[PDB]
Amino acid sequence: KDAWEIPRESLRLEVKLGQGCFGEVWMGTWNGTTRVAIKTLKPGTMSPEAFLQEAQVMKKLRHEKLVQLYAVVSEEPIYIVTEYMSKGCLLDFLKGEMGKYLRLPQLVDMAAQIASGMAYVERMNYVHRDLRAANILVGENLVCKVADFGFPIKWTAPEAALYGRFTIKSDVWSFGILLTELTTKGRVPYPGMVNREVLDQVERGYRMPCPPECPESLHDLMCQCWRKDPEERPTFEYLQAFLEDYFTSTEPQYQPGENL
Numbered sequence: 001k002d003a004w005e006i007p008r009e010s011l012r013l014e015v016k017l018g019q020g021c022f023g024e025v026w027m028g029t030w031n032g033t034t035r036v037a038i039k040t041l042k043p044g045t046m047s048p049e050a051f052l053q054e055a056q057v058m059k060k061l062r063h064e065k066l067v068q069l070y071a072v073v074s075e076e077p078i079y080i081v082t083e084y085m086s087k088g089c090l091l092d093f094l095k096g097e098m099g100k101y102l103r104l105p106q107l108v109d110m111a112a113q114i115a116s117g118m119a120y121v122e123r124m125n126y127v128h129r130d131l132r133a134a135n136i137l138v139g140e141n142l143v144c145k146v147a148d149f150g151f152p153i154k155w156t157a158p159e160a161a162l163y164g165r166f167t168i169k170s171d172v173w174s175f176g177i178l179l180t181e182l183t184t185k186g187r188v189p190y191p192g193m194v195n196r197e198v199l200d201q202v203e204r205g206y207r208m209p210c211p212p213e214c215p216e217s218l219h220d221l222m223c224q225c226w227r228k229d230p231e232e233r234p235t236f237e238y239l240q241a242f243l244e245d246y247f248t249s250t251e252p253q254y255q256p257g258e259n260l
Ligand SMILES: CN(C)CCCC(=O)Nc1ccc2ncnc(Nc3ccc(NC(=O)Nc4cc(C(C)(C)C)nn4-c4cccc(N)c4)cc3)c2c1
Pocket: 017, 018, 025, 037, 053, 054, 055, 057, 058, 061, 066, 067, 082, 083, 084, 085, 086, 087, 088, 089, 092, 128, 137, 146, 147, 148, 149, 150
């Protein structure tokens, strides 16, 4: 037990948020003061030391654009407590009521935040392996933090998908896919394509067309993310700055339209 550890009675499990094969996810209250998020272990469905490796990582990786861990409870029933992200999951957020209202500026700003967090991961020599709209959490004021909810081939770089070469450059690839999600307001990438077609076509050379009303400059950044050679892909550091500076440096001529 370490300084993260807490007492169960200091917690208050209020509303359910969704079941998984290994436990539940509940909204609730820490010390009667703090909006919180709690993950459960369904007893004897997994080794109590592997369920708590999720926490081992969340301790090592602390950054303003990453999900902050709060506290653990280590004697079964086990818990992991992290901050509470109000708008919930970024995918649901985009294909919901706030969808039609979002425009490029808001959308780019979200992308920048994600790149920034992923930039931090780049510093740490950690690899995400499953970045995409579904693993982003959205808070107040459109804050976006990198999370992981626990085969996503349409989002995975081919060297990873095929030979298990997982790397920050394979993450960079998924980022580019993430950008299409942002520009199409929560759509599935490669519409009308089954999982085998993706593999087959991608290797042959196919790439996603510039989405409607998306500046050709932005689509270009996507293609840079999808470069065949893992080493020709840009760094998250570069991407962060690109996106932050976008409407001064890259498209100052930007005119808002029907959808973006
Ligand atoms: C589909 N719709 C319709 C319904 C949606 C239902 C809904 O509304 N849900 C909801 C709403 C608001 C929520 N608000 C907050 N948290 C939630 N939950 C929440 C918070 C955190 C995490 N975990 C992580 O982030 N882990 C994580 C981060 C990292 C980094 C950072 C990459 C090192 N590594 N790992 C990690 C490491 C090892 C193993 C694993 N598994 C993970 C999981 C869930 C919420 C959930």
